[PDB]
Amino acid sequence: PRSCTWPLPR
Amino acid sequence: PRSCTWPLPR
Amino acid sequence: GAMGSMERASLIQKAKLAEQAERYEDMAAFMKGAVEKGEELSCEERNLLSVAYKNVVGGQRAAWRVLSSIEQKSNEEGSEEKGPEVREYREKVETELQGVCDTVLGLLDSHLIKEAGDAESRVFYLKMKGDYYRYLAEVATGDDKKRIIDSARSAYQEAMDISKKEMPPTNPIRLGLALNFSVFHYEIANSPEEAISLAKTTFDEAMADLHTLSEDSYKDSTLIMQLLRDNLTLWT
Amino acid sequence: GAMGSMERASLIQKAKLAEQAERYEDMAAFMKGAVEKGEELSCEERNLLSVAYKNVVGGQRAAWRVLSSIEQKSNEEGSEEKGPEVREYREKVETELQGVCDTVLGLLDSHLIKEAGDAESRVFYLKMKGDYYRYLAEVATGDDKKRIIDSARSAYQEAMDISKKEMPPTNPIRLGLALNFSVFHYEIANSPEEAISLAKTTFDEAMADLHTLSEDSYKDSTLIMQLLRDNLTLWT
Ligand SMILES: *SCCNC(=O)[C@H]1CCCN(C(=O)c2cc(Cl)c(O)c(Cl)c2)C1
Ligand SMILES: *SCCNC(=O)[C@H]1CCCN(C(=O)c2cc(Cl)c(O)c(Cl)c2)C1
Ligand SMILES: [Mg+2]
Ligand SMILES: [Mg+2]
Ligand SMILES: [Mg+2]
Ligand SMILES: [Mg+2]
């Protein structure tokens, strides 16, 4: 997976 | 559902 | 045009990269540049042109439908007055959509259709002409609506006449044409019985010709055949 | 600017319509117009600005990654020479991405950050500044790369210092800031241990403060907390 950042695009 | 047409967008 | 300085082959190469990157506006601009080089398009190149603009106009049509639905609800009894903004923004998206349709129709008229002598290429382009007049018809409301509708009908009908004469009933372009013309009848021409008749006849004639096909051709044809069945199930 | 003649309230109304229509380029242009009216942004308006540009740059970043991967493979031993087209098109997307980042950074510098006195708004904008320098850093390769990286670090650090002083550990902006700064450490600064330490400390301090929250606030906070856990699971 790619690392999560916030906010997430739709 | 919406009626199917071809080609379908990604 | 901004693509006038780029090699034809480079434009086709970049259209394929744009597809991989899901950059469909770029894809369409590259393929417009390729068409404007003035040479006929190969089978694969026609497919790139079609996929590019179908994805662009598909996003615009989806947005237009969202905005038109909001606008319709705003005009129901008991709905609070919200000002001109919904109509304005719907009109903005509509005008952009109409622009894309006009661009595609312009490429077909100058000069893809007239230079297309083989049945496969001519039918391909006439189907596109029907499709983009159909998208214009989805948003049309003025003095010209009936003529837009008849322009779609006329292009589809010419494509149908050629495809019946010159292509097997399982041909994927013939199948997609008949699928889309059947939706034209249902959604645009207020002719659901014609839509159902066309879908059924198209499906049955293709079924009867599948025995002639290779495995790979069978997959191409049955994929579109399933869309005919899906529509018949929605409509009956 | 092309939005200079439109009312601020109409721009915000249309940004919300564009979001509903998944028209994020339009959304961003409407919110840029709203910012350029010169008034501070409310909480909801900041969220619209953030969502709009995050979706625009998100598509560009995804496309850039596809194209960079193709370009890298083209430069491996045994790869056929294909000409300049992959690099050219990667550069085209890169330049467009850099333009969007520069536009957002320009709005923050003129004059969102300097007029933001409340901790929530100041932290929100400094987090955005860190994020868009981070997206510039993802594509940077020249003399300026280290300074781009330090600009991201510096904005994130100022946001962190304010948020620790002025906001609870469960605050969603504080949480998203720490999440993104931890990814900055892992992906950009080559500091995986700092990334893991920050994610873990942020998660644990938020856990300990959840008991103070309403049900609705608890949902907002735990949603981002799960992303911290997801990253820790990827990284350990
Ligand atoms: S171009 C090389 C061989 N491929 C094709 O001839 C067709 C074959 C069957 C599948 N195809 C379609 O179904 C099709 C694609 C597109 Cl982009 C259209 O606009 C339509 Cl109408 C049909 C490609
Ligand atoms: S603006 C009215 C009340 N809502 C909010 O204050 C926050 C509340 C918690 C959820 N939010 C976020 O998680 C969030 C949204 C966006 Cl667009 C960001 O860029 C970030 Cl960093 C966090 C909205
Ligand atoms: Mg109109
Ligand atoms: Mg008939
Ligand atoms: Mg560059
Ligand atoms: Mg620390």
Author numbering:
A (entry chain B), B (entry chain B): 20 to 29
C (entry chain A), D (entry chain A): -670 to -666, 1 to 231
The publication says:
The binding affinity of compound 2 to 14-3-3σ was >10,000-fold better in the presence of the FOXO1 phosphopeptide than apo 14-3-3σ and all other phosphopeptide clients (DR50 = 360 nM vs >2 mM). Compounds 2, 3, and 4 showed the greatest fold-stabilization in the protein titrations decreasing 14-3-3σ/FOXO1 KD values 5-fold, 4-fold, and 12-fold. A cocrystal structure for FOXO1/2/14-3-3σ was obtained, with clear density for both 2 and the FOXO1 peptide. The phenyl ring of 2 stacked against the front of the FOXO1 peptide consisting of the +1 Trp and the +2 Pro residues. Strikingly, in the presence of 2, the Trp of FOXO1 underwent a conformational change to form a hydrogen bond with its NH and the amide carbonyl of 2. Moreover, the hydroxyl on the phenyl ring of 2 made a hydrogen bond with the S45 of 14-3-3σ, explaining the benefit of a hydrogen donor or, potentially, acceptor at that position. An overlay of 2 with the other peptides revealed that 2 could not reach the smaller +1 residues in the other client peptides or that the peptides sterically clashed, potentially explaining its selectivity for FOXO1 over the other peptides. By contrast, the +2 Pro of FOXO1 locked the conformation of the +1 Trp and thereby prevented such a π–π stacking interaction with 2, while the +2 Arg of Pin-1 allowed π–π stacking to take place. The stabilizers for FOXO1 had a highly conserved scaffold, consistent with the rigidity of this peptide.
14-3-3 is ubiquitously expressed in mammals and plays multiple roles within the cell, including phosphorylation protection, conformational changes, subcellular trafficking, and induction or disruption of other PPIs.13,27−29 14-3-3 typically binds to a phosphorylated serine/threonine in intrinsically disordered regions of its clients. Of the 7 isoforms found in mammalian cells, 14-3-3σ is the only one that harbors a cysteine residue proximal to the client binding groove, providing an additional degree of isoform specificity. The disulfide tethering screen targeted C38, a native cysteine on 14-3-3σ located proximal to the natural product binding pocket within the phosphopeptide recognition groove. We explored the scope of disulfide tethering for the discovery of selective PPI stabilizers (molecular glues) using the hub protein 14-3-3σ.
